[PDB]
Design a protein around this ligand. Structure first.
Ligand SMILES: Nc1ncnc2c1ncn2[C@@H]1O[C@H](COP(=O)(O)O)[C@@H](O)[C@H]1O
Length: 536
């Protein structure tokens, strides 16, 4: 159900040296041997060398094989920032199995979609995290007939398979499999726009290219200490350059259990972090904690680069990074579908603070077009289209959607409005896709509406983004009741019971007799645009 690059593009990318032929199977073996004695992972009271990570993943892989996981099987991995994540991911790569990455904030609705769409053989979860019981969630899927036949729990297993069961056998490399580098190595979730998010297949060759190139752009080496402040399996903290870039270069990955200034600054001080990645709301929290007193004492001198991305970072805030934190800002504008843009570490400050970077690859093609696919004069704002050696050509098993998201000649419609500077940098100026960006977490208005409409007291609903100085947008729901409106508390509870991801629950509920817009003779997309203007 994947879409391949055209043969003439694949040839171009291999001859250019982007696509090298290495697989993640090769990657695990080579990097853990090349850097064996160095420190690879710090988290949860654990300190693992590359050698130990190699040994642990080889044991795990043997136990997953004994469980029934074979080459090509999809396995949904929904783990917090704990060291078990990396040994689980490396193990799956050793078997030639495909991780299917879910984030900790995802819930029954999203996990059901991933398991059924990917036909997953297993689900790997923690017992509890941030007050949520993932064992109960897995049990709900089992009750509905939608759960993978294997459920593995990190922690107290309940009635499922404890992770420790997978460690019972000595390593057996006879069960490992090396896939083809052109094959999909894993699946990840898109941001989502009109409903259920599409699955994104990424290949060994194209993803490892973005990892290698990102490690070079970001000056990574064995002296790198990368703090995973964001959920590590998101594309940004996984590959831009993320923990894979760090592993590629032989550095240390430090896991932050949460991104609070107290927790993160304590790790930066203790472990001497040199680079980390955050979304704008976290960057603002860190800046405020240091500048306005709460954390001014912390020793952040080891921090060289603060990456900020996933959502728009205002120039005003960006200008605070070096004066307040003492480090170089790097803006990162990327997407799970491919294209990643970076400001360069030796760009002038005016470029670093006012742009969202330029693409990784010389073969990243950038088209900025008007509403009729005509290129806009250089400097003007238009729709961003892109094509390149690590941008996909189609979503996983999304035949009808792919016909709309990609041009006939293979350009991906990002849904972003951008303008290009003379030096190739891009400035993100708006959005055309129907998607609310809540401080880096993407919310589909139509998806939230559909669940709201399922409540028996609701007659109609419209979900829009309301401008917010810290998150960019919050999620506001306009609701028209049939007669008496439900309890705002009640409606939000009904949405949690539905299984919506935590960040998709609206911040604001406004019950109205009618939508406060003229000509309610307009499409639902235009309706949301007019409602959002009242809130901006
Ligand atoms: N630096 C940035 N500035 C503005 N928007 C961004 C930035 N980075 C990512 N995005 C948005 O996040 C989307 C990708 O979502 P994700 O797949 O979560 O990375 C992009 O298409 C943009 O809408």
């Amino acid at each position: 159900g994947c879409t391949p690059w055209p043969a003439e593009f694949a040839v171009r990318y291999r001859e250019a040296g982007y696509w090298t032929g290495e697989t993640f199977s090769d990657f695990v073996t080579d990097r853990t041997r090349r850097f064996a004695d160095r420190l690879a992972v710090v988290g949860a009271g654990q300190r693992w060398t590359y050698a130990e990570l190699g040994e642990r993943s080889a044991v795990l892989a043997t136990g997953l094989a004994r469980l029934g996981i074979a080459a090509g099987d999809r396995v949904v991995v929904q783990l917090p920032n704990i060291p078990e994540l990396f040994e689980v991911v490396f193990a799956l790569f050793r078997l030639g199995a495909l991780p299917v990455y879910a984030l900790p904030a995802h819930r029954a609705h999203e996990i059901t979609h991933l398991c059924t769409t990917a036909q997953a053989k297993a689900l790997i979860i923690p017992d509890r995290h941030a007050g949520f019981d993932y064992r109960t969630m897995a049990a709900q899927l089992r009750h509905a007939g939608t759960a993978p036949e294997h459920v593995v729990v990190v922690g107290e297993p309940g009635g499922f398979t404890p992770l420790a069961e997978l460690r019972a056998d000595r390593p057996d490399p006879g069960v490992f499999t090396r896939p083809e580098a052109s094959d999909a190595a894993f699946l990840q979730l898109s941001g989502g726009t009109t409903g259920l998010p599409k699955l994104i297949p990424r290949t060994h060759d194209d993803y490892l290219y973005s990892v290698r190139a990102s490690a070079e752009i970001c000056a990574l080496g064995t002296d790198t200490v990368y703090l995973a402040a964001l959920p590590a399996v998101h594309n940004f903290p996984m590959s831009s350059p993320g923990f894979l870039g760090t592993f590629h270069a032989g550095g240390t990955v430090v896991l932050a259990p949460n991104p609070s200034p107290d927790t993160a600054f304590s790790l930066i001080e203790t472990e001497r972090v040199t680079i980390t990645a955050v979304v704008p709301p976290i960057a603002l929290q860190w800046l405020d904690a240091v500048e306005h007193g709460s954390q001014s004492h912390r020793d952040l001198s080891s921090l060289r680069v603060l990456q900020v991305g996933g959502a728009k970072f205002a120039p005003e805030a960006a200008r605070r990074v070096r004066p307040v934190l003492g480090c170089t800002l790097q803006q990162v504008f990327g997407m799970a579908e491919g294209l990643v843009n970076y400001t360069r570490l030796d760009d002038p400050d005016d470029i670093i603070t006012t742009t969202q970077g330029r693409p990784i690859s010389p073969d990243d093609e950038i088209r900025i077009v008007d509403e009729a696919d005509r290129p806009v004069p250089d400097g003007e704002v238009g729709h961003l289209l892109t094509r390149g050696p690590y941008t996909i050509r189609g979503y996983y098993r999304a035949e009808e959607h792919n016909a709309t998201a990609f041009t006939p000649d293979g350009f991906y419609r990002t849904g972003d409005l951008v303008r290009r500077t003379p030096t190739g940098h891009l400035v993100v100026e708006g959005r055309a896709k129907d998607q609310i960006n809540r401080g880096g977490e993407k919310v589909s208005a139509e998806e939230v509406e559909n669940h709201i409409l399922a409540h028996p007291a609701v007659h109609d609903a419209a979900v829009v983004g309301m401008s917010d100085p810290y998150l960019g947008e919050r999620v506001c729901a306009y609701v028209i009741a049939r007669t008496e409106p439900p309890s705002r508390s009640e409606l939000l509870r009904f949405l949690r019971e539905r299984g919506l991801a935590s960040y998709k629950i609206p911040d604001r509920v406004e019950f109205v007799d009618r939508f406060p817009v003229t000509g309610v003779k307009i499409s639902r997309s235009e309706l949301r645009r007019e409602l959002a203007r009242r809130l901006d």
